[PDB]
Write a protein that binds this ligand. Sequence first.
Ligand SMILES: N=C(N)NCCC[C@H](NC(=O)[C@@H]1CCC/C1=C\[C@H](COP(=O)(O)O)NC(=O)[C@@H](N)Cc1ccccc1)C(N)=O
Length: 146
Amino acid sequence: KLPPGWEKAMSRSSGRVYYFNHITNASQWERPSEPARVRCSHLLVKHSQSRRPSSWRQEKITRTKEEALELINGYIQKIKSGEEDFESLASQFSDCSSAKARGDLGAFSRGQMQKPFEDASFALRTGEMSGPVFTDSGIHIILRTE
Ligand SMILES: N=C(N)NCCC[C@H](NC(=O)[C@@H]1CCC/C1=C\[C@H](COP(=O)(O)O)NC(=O)[C@@H](N)Cc1ccccc1)C(N)=O
C-alpha cells in the first residue's frame, strides 16, 4: 500500500507515473518497497534565513533560500547520476560541522533533531536518500545509513 509518506504522481514531461514522498521529498520512477534509533548522514546548505547564517565554509552566508535550493538540486542530480557520491559532496560542500565526518551525524532517536529532519530521517529506509528537507538550519539532503 506504499510505505509511509509515499503517493502516486504523474510526470509532466513524460506522462509516466512516479512516486513522491511528502515527508522525505524523495522522488522515484520505481514503486517503493519503527526503529528506536536511526543513523543518518546529511549535506546542509545554509542560506540567509538560516537560524545561524554562518559555517566553517564561510563566515557570513548571504545566499538566498532559492539559491540554496538550486545547489541542493544540483547535488541531488550528481548523486543520482553517479557523477559524485554523497560523502564526497558532504565533505566539500556541507555547511555543517559533520562535513568532516562525510556528513555522518551518528545515531539518534525521536526528540533530538529538528522535527522535519527527524520525520524525514525516520521515513527513509536504510540506504535511502531524501530530496530537499527544509529546517531552520537550512536545506538538507539526508542519507539513512542504519
Ligand atoms: N527538539 C529540538 N527541536 N531540538 C533542536 C535540535 C536542533 C539541532 N540540529 C538539527 O536538528 C540539524 C539537523 C542535523 C544537524 C543540525 C544542525 C547543526 C548545524 O546547523 P546549525 O545548528 O548551525 O544551524 N548540526 C550540528 O551538528 C551542530 N554542530 C549544531 C548544534 C545543534 C545544537 C546545539 C549546538 C550546536 C540538534 N540538536 O541536532
